[PDB]
Design a protein around this ligand. Structure first.
Ligand code: HEC
Length: 104
């Protein structure tokens, strides 16, 4: 994936609901710092659905690749109202961006 392309995707498709930085605010969706290795539904201070709390997976490259294609298919009942990113390359770029931005 291409980090710079992924940054642009994040701004267009994600940033209205999510921050990535350490100490960034929860918004409509949870702050995503530490995403890689985070268990579903475990960010303190965010009110998740039971569906997101109970999915029982660890976020990382492949679980994110699947989720982001079609969130509701991966986590039925999620309150993340986002249809998905259909192009594999776009998902890969976004994930590469997230891997950097959620760790910095
Ligand atoms: C607002 C309209 C959203 C947009 C646009 C995106 N996300 Fe989101 N996300 C949102 C909510 C309300 C939640 C919680 C859902 C629930 O059912 O409780 C989420 C959740 C995620 C998660 C899971 C995080 C966890 O701690 O388990 C991830 C990884 C995530 N969102 C990522 C993400 C990305 C990368 C987006 C752009 C493609 C994106 N979301 C858009 C709300 C909104």
């Amino acid at each position: 994936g291409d980090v710079e392309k992924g940054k642009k995707i994040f701004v267009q498709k994600c940033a209205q609901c999510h921050t990535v930085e350490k100490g960034g605010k929860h918004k409509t969706g949870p702050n995503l710092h530490g995403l890689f290795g985070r268990k579903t539904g475990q960010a303190a201070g965010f009110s998740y659905t039971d569906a997101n709390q109970n999915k029982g997976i660890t976020w990382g490259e492949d679980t994110l690749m699947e989720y982001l294609e079609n969130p509701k298919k991966y986590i039925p009942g999620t309150k993340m109202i986002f249809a998905g990113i259909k192009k594999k390359g776009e998902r890969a770029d976004l994930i590469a961006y997230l891997k950097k931005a959620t760790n910095e």
